[PDB]
Amino acid sequence: MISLIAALAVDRVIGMENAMPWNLPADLAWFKRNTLNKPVIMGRHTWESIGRPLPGRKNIILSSQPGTDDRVTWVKSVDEAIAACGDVPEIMVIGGGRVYEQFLPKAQKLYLTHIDAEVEGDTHFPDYEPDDWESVFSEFHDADAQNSHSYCFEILERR
Ligand SMILES: NC(=O)c1ccc[n+]([C@@H]2O[C@H](COP(=O)([O-])OP(=O)(O)OC[C@H]3O[C@@H](n4cnc5c(N)ncnc54)[C@H](OP(=O)(O)O)[C@@H]3O)[C@@H](O)[C@H]2O)c1
Ligand SMILES: Nc1nc(=O)c2nc(CNc3ccc(C(=O)N[C@@H](CCC(=O)O)C(=O)O)cc3)cnc2[nH]1
């Protein structure tokens, strides 16, 4: 099974030139819980923004160019990225926009964080049709002393 995981503001914004103007440790805890011990596939821009390998996960980076860090696995196409995952129950695709676009048609589950924030961005999660997906889990949280905005975790499974 292939799954996508993302945090989206309104209008599906997931990225901007500068750092996002939110602080959501609860969302990062959620991303951790849902990705540990599974292979994660990311594109090279997302790799550069994370800055290190994510512990406890097989990290697979898509790039057209030769790799620059032997601690992770570098692949040059989508088919190679899936092959590099091996025989696992669930592959986690962690972005960014160009990567989500290519993997959406293959995905059976979406793990989405919807954030109550309006921001101008340059990168969006792909458009998806709510009726093509079943909402199996949803939980809303208010902002608090640690988290700057309200947010809702949702898991969707493809109909
Ligand atoms: N809010 C969230 O959930 C979230 C999640 C992830 C990322 N983000 C944000 O999203 C932004 C980056 O997204 P993005 O679309 O610019 O970048 P991206 O998808 O992370 O990376 C794109 C890069 O991946 C490589 N690539 C992609 N598909 C490929 C293919 N089929 N074959 C070979 N290489 C391929 C290319 O690397 P080369 O250029 O080296 O060829 C490409 O330039 C940042 O703002 C980041 O912080 C947000
Ligand atoms: N829901 C969700 N939220 C995100 O912020 C997110 N970010 C990415 C890409 N960027 C990042 C950036 C940093 C870390 C990170 O440092 N995570 C650590 C720390 C978690 C914690 O502080 O609890 C990790 O071990 O996963 C992960 C992904 C992809 N999917 C996402 N999905």
Numbering used by the authors: 1 to 159
Pull verbatim passages from the article behind this deposition.
Dihydrofolate reductase (DHFR) is a key enzyme that is essential for the synthesis of purines, thymidylic acids and some amino acids. DHFR catalyzes the reduction of 7,8-dihydrofolate to 5,6,7,8-tetrahydrofolate using NADPH as a cofactor and plays an influential role in folate (FOL) management in many species. The M20 loop of ecDHFR can adopt three conformations (open, closed and occluded). We determined the structure of ecDHFR in complex with FOL and NADP+ under pressures varying between 0.1 and 800 MPa.
The ecDHFR crystal in this study contains both the open and closed conformations of the M20 loop. Hence, for the open conformation two independent molecules, A and B, existed in the asymmetric unit of the P21 crystal at lower pressures. Because little difference existed between the two molecules, only the B chain is discussed and presented in the figures. In the M20-open crystal, a crystal-to-crystal phase transition occurred between 270 and 500 MPa. The space group of the crystal changed from P21 to C2. Below 270 MPa, the nicotinamide moiety of NADP+ made van der Waals contacts with the pteridine moiety of FOL. The guanidinium moiety of Arg57 directly interacted with the carboxyl group of FOL between 0.1 and 660 MPa. That of the M20-open crystal decreased from 32 485 Å3 at atmospheric pressure to 30 970 Å3 at 660 MPa. The M20-open crystals contained (110, 107), (85, 88), 130, 137 and 134 water molecules at 0.1, 270, 500, 660 and 750 MPa, respectively (the pairs of values in parentheses indicate the numbers for the A and B chains in the asymmetric unit).
